CSV table of C-alpha atoms and ligand atoms in Angstrom, one decimal:
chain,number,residue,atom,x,y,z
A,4,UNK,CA,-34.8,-49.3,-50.0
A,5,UNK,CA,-35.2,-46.2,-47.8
A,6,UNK,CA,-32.5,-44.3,-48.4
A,7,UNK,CA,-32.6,-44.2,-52.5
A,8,UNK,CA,-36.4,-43.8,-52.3
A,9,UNK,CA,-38.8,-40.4,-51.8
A,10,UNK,CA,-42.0,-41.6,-51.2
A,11,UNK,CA,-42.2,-44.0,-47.9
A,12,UNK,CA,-45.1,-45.9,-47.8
A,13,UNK,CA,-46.5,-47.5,-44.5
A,14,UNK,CA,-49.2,-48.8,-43.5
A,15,UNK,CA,-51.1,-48.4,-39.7
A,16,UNK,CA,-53.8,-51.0,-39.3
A,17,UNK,CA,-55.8,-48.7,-36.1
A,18,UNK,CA,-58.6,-48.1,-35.6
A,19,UNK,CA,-58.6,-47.9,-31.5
A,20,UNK,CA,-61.7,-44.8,-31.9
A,21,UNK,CA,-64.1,-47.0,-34.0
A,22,UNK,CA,-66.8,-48.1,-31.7
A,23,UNK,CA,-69.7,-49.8,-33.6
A,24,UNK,CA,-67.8,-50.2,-37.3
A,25,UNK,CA,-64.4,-51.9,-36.3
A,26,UNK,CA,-62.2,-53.5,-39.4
A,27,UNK,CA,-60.0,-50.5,-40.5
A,28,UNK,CA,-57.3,-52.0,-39.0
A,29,UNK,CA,-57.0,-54.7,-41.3
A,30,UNK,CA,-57.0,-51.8,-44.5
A,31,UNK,CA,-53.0,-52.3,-45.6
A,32,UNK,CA,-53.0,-56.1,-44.4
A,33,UNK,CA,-55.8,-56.6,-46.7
A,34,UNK,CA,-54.1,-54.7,-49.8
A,35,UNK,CA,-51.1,-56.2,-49.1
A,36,UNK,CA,-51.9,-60.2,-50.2
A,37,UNK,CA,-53.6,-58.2,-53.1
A,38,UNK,CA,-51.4,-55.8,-54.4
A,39,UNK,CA,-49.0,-58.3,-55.8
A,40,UNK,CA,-51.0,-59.1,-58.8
A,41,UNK,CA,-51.8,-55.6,-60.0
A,42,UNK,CA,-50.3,-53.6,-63.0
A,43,UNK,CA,-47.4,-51.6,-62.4
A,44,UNK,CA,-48.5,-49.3,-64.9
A,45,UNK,CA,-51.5,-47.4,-65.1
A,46,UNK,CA,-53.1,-46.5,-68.5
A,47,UNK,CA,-55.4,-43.6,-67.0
A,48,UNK,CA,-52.1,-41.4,-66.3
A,49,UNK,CA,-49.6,-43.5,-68.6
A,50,UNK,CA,-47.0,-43.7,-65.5
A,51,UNK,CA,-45.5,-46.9,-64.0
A,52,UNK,CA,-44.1,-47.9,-60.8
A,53,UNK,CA,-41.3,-49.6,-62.2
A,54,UNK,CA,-39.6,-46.0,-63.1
A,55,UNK,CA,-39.3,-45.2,-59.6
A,56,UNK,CA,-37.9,-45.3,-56.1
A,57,UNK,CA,-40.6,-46.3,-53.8
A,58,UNK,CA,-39.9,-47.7,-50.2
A,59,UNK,CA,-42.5,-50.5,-48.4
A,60,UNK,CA,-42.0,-50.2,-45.4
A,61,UNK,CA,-44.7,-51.9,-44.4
A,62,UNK,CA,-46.9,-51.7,-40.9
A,63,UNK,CA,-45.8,-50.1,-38.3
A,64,UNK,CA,-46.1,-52.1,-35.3
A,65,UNK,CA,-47.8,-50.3,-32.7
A,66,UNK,CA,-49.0,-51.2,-29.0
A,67,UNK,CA,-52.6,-51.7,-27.8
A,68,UNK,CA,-55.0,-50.3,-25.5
A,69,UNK,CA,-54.3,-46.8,-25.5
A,70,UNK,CA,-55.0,-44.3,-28.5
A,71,UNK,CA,-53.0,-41.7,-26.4
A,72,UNK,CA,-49.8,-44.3,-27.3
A,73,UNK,CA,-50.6,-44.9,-31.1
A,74,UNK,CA,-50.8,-41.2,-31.9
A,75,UNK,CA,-47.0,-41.0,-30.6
A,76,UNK,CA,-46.1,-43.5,-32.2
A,77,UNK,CA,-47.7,-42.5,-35.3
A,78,UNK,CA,-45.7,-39.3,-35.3
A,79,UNK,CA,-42.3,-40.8,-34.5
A,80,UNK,CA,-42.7,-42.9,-37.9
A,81,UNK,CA,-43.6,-40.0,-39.8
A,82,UNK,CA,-41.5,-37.4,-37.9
A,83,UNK,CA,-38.4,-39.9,-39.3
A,84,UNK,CA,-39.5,-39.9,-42.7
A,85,UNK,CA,-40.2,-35.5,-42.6
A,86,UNK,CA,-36.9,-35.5,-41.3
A,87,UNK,CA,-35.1,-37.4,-44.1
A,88,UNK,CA,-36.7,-35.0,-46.7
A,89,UNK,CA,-38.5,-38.0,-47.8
A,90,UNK,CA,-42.7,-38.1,-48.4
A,91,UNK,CA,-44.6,-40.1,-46.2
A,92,UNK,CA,-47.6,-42.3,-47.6
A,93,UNK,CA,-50.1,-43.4,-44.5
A,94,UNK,CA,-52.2,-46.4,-45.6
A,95,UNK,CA,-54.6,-45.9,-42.4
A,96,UNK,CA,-57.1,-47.4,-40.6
A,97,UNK,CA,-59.4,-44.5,-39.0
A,98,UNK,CA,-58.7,-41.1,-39.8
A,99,UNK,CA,-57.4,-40.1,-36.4
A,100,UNK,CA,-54.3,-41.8,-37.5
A,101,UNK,CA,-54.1,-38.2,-39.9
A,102,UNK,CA,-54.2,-35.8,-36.9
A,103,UNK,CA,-50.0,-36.9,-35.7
A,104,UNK,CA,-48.7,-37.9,-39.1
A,105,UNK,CA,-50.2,-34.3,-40.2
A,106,UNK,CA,-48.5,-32.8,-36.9
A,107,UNK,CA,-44.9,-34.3,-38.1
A,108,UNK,CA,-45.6,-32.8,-41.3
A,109,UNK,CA,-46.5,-29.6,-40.3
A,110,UNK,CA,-43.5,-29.5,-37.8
A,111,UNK,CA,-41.4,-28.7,-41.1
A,112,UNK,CA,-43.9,-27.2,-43.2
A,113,UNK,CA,-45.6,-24.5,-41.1
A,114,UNK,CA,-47.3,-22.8,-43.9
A,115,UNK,CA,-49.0,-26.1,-45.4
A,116,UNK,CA,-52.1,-26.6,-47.2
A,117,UNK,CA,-54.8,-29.5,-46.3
A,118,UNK,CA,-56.8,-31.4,-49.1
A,119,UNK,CA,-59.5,-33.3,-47.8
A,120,UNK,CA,-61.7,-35.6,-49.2
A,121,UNK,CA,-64.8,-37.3,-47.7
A,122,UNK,CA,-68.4,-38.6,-47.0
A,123,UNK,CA,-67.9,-36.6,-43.9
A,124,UNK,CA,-67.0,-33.2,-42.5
A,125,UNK,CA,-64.9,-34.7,-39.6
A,126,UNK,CA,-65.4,-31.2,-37.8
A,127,UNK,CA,-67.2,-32.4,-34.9
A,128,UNK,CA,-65.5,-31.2,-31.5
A,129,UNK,CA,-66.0,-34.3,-30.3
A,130,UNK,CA,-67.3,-37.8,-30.2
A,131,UNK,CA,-68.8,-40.6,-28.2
A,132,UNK,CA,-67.2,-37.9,-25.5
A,133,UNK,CA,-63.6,-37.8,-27.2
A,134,UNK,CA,-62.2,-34.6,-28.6
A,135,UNK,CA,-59.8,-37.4,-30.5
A,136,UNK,CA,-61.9,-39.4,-32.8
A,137,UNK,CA,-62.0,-40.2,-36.5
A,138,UNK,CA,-65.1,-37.4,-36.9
A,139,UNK,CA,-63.2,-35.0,-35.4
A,140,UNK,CA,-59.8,-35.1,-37.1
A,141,UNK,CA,-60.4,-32.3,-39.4
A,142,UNK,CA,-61.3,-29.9,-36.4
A,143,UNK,CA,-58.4,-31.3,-34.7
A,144,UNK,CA,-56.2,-30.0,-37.7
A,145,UNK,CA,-57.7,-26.3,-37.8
A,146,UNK,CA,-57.2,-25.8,-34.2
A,147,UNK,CA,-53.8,-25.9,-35.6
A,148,UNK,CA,-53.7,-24.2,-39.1
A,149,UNK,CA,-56.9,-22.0,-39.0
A,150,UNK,CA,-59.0,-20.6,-41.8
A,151,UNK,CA,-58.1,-20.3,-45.3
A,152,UNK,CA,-55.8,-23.5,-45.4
A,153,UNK,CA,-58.1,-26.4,-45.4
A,154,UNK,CA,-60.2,-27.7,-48.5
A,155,UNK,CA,-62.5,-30.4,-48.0
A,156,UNK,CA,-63.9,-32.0,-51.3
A,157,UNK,CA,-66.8,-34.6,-51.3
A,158,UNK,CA,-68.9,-34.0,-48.4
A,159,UNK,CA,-72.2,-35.0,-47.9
A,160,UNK,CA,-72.8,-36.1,-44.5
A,161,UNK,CA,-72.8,-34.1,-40.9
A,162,UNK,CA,-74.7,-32.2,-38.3
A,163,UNK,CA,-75.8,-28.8,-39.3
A,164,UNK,CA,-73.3,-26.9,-37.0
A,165,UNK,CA,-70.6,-28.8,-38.8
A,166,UNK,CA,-71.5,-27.1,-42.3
A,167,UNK,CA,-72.1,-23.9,-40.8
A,168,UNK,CA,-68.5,-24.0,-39.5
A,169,UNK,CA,-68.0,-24.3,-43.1
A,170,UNK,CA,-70.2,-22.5,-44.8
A,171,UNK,CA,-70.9,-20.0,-43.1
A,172,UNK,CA,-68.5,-19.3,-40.4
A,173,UNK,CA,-66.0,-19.9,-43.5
A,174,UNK,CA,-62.8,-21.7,-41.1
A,175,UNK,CA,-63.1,-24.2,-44.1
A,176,UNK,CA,-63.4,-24.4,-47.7
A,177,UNK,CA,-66.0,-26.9,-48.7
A,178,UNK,CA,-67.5,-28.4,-51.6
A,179,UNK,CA,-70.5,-30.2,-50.6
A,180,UNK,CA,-71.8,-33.3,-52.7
A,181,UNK,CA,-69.2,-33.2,-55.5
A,182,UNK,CA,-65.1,-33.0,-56.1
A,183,UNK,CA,-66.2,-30.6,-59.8
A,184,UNK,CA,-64.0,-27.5,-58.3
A,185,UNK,CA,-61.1,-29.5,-57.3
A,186,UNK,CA,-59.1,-28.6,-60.5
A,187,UNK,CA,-59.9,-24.6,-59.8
A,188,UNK,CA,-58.6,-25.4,-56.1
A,189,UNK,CA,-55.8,-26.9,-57.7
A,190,UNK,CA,-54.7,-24.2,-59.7
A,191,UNK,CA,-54.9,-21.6,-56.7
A,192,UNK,CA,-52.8,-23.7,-54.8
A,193,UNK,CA,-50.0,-23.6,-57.4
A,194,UNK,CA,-46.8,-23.8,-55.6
A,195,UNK,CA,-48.0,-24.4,-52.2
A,196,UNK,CA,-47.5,-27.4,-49.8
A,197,UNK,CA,-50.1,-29.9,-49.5
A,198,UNK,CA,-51.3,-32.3,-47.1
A,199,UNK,CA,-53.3,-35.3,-49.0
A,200,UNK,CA,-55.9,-36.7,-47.0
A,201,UNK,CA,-58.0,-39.3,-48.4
A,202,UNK,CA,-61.1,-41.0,-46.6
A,203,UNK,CA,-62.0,-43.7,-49.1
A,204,UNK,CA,-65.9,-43.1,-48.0
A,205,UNK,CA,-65.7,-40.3,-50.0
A,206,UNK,CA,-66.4,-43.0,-52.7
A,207,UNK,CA,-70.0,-43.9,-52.9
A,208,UNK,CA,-71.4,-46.2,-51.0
A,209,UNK,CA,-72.1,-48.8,-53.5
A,210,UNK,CA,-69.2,-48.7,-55.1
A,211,UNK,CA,-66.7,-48.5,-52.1
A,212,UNK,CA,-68.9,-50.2,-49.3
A,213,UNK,CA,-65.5,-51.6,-47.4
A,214,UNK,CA,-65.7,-48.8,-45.3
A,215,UNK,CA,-67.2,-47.7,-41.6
A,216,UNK,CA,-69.7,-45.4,-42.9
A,217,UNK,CA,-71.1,-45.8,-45.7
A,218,UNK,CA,-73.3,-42.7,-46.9
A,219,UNK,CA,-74.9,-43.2,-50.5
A,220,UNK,CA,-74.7,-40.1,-52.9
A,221,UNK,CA,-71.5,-40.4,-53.3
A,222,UNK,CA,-69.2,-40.7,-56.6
A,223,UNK,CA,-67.9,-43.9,-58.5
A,224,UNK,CA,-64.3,-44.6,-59.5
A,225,UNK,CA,-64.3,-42.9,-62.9
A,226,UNK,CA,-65.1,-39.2,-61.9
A,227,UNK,CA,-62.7,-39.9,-58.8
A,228,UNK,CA,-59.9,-41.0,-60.9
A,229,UNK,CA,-59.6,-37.7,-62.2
A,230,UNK,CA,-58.6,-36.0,-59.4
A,231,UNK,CA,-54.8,-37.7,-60.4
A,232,UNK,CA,-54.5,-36.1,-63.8
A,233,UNK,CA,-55.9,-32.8,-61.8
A,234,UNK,CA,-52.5,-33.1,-59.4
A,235,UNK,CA,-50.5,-34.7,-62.1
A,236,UNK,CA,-51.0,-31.6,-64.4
A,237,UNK,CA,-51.2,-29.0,-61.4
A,238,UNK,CA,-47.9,-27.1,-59.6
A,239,UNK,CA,-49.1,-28.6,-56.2
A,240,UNK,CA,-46.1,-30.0,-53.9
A,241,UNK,CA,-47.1,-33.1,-52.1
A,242,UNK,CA,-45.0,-33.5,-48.4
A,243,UNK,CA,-47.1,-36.1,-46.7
A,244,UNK,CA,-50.5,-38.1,-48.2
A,245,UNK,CA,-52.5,-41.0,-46.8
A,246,UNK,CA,-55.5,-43.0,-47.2
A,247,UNK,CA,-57.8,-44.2,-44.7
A,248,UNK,CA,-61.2,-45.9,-43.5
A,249,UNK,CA,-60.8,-49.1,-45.8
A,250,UNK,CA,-62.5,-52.1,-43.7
A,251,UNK,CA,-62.4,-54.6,-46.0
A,252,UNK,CA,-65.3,-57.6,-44.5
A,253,UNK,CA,-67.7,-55.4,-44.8
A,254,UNK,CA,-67.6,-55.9,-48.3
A,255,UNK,CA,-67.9,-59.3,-48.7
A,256,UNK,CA,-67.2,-59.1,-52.7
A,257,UNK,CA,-63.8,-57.8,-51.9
A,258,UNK,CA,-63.7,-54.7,-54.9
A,259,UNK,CA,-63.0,-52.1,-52.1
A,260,UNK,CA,-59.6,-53.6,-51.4
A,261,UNK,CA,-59.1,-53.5,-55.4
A,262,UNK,CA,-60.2,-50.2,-55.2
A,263,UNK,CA,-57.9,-48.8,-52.6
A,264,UNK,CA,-55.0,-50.7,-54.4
A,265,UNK,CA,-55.8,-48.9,-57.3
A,266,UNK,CA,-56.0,-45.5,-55.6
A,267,UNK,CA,-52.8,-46.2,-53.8
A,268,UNK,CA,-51.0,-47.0,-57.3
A,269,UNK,CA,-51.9,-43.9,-58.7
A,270,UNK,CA,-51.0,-41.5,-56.0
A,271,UNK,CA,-47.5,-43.1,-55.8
A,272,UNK,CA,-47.3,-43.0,-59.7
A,273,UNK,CA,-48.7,-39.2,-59.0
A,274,UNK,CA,-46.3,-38.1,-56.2
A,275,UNK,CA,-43.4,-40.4,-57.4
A,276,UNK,CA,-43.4,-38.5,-60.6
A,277,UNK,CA,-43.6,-34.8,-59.2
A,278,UNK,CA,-40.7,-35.5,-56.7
A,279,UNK,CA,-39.0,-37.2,-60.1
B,1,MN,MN1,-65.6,-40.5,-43.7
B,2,MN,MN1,-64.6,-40.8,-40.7
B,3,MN,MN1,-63.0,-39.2,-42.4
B,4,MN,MN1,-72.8,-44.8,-61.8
């Protein structure tokens, strides 16, 4: 029930920016006939979902033809949840659908803290001609915060310009090709407020091939797993998470809808045990 739970998970099956890659949309549909036969309790972090308050709210229903329209709409749902001093939990379709759930968050939260992980930088201004896409989100989010506040984990795909605006022109933190200094990030950020973003492609490519764009090099489940017990044992406060860019045909063996159930499960267990 909403009122007696925290964490409010939802799901947004959009993915209205996706030109060539389409499927996102069908992310929390997809975990949702799947879910149901999963363990409640997970053996990695020795937590179960049972012990806690956790509100489905399932998708939110949201009209068509005009990403304009979704964005709003993503935000009103999230605004609601910021406003009841309750967490919200995106289960996305594209990343875009971080850019207004982040703005609701950040309405309350103005000194908040971004954690990003992905294949990809996202910092593009724009594109196919749109300053909104799902490869521009992150720069959409630093015209807003600025340097020093996002911390992207994972990347290993971009244009050069993108890494430079990282790397060189420092607006970002960035850890290319790995997630190894997430735990020293971690630390740093003890008692500050975090945004959780979570592109699934950060995942490699074999292993999580349910996705848009895939980009090999990436890393398996095991070494991603332990970026829980990293927040589990850390001082971080989570106000708003979400994970996006599952497409689940593309991979026809079905794992990557496992997978993103499993990563769900744990970030609940995660967040659901911090807020206590
Ligand atoms: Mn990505
Ligand atoms: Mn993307
Ligand atoms: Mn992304
Ligand atoms: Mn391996």
């Amino acid at each position: 029930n909403y009122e007696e739970s925290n964490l409010i998970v939802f799901g947004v099956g959009f993915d209205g920016t996706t030109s060539n890659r389409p499927g996102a949309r069908f992310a929390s549909s997809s975990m949702r006939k799947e879910f149901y036969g999963l363990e409640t309790y997970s053996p990695f972090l020795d937590l179960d979902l049972e012990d806690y308050n956790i509100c489905d709210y399932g998708d939110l229903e949201i009209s068509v033809g005009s990403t304009e329209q979704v964005l709003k709409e993503i935000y009103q749902e999230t605004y609601k949840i910021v406003r009841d001093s309750k967490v919200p939990f995106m289960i996305g379709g594209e990343h875009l659908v971080t850019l207004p759930a982040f703005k609701a968050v950040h309405e309350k939260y103005n000194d908040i803290y971004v954690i990003h992980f992905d294949a990809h930088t996202d910092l593009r201004e724009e594109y196919n001609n749109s300053k909104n896409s799902h490869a521009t989100v992150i720069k959409r989010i630093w015209d807003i915060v600025g340097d020093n506040k996002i911390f992207q984990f994972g990347i290993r795909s971009g244009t050069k310009e993108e890494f430079k605006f990282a790397t060189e022109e420092k607006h970002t933190y960035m850890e290319i090709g790995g997630i190894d200094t997430f735990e020293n990030i971690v630390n740093m950020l003890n008692g500050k407020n975090i945004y959780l973003t979570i592109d699934l492609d950060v995942l490699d490519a074999s292993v999580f091939p349910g996705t848009g764009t895939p980009e090999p090099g990436g890393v398996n489940y095991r070494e991603f797993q332990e970026i829980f017990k990293i927040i589990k044992n850390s001082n971080i406060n989570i106000v708003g998470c979400d994970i996006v860019e599952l497409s689940p045909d593309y991979d026809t063996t079905g794992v990557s809808t496992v997978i993103a159930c499993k990563i769900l499960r744990e970030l609940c267990l995660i967040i659901s045990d911090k807020i206590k």
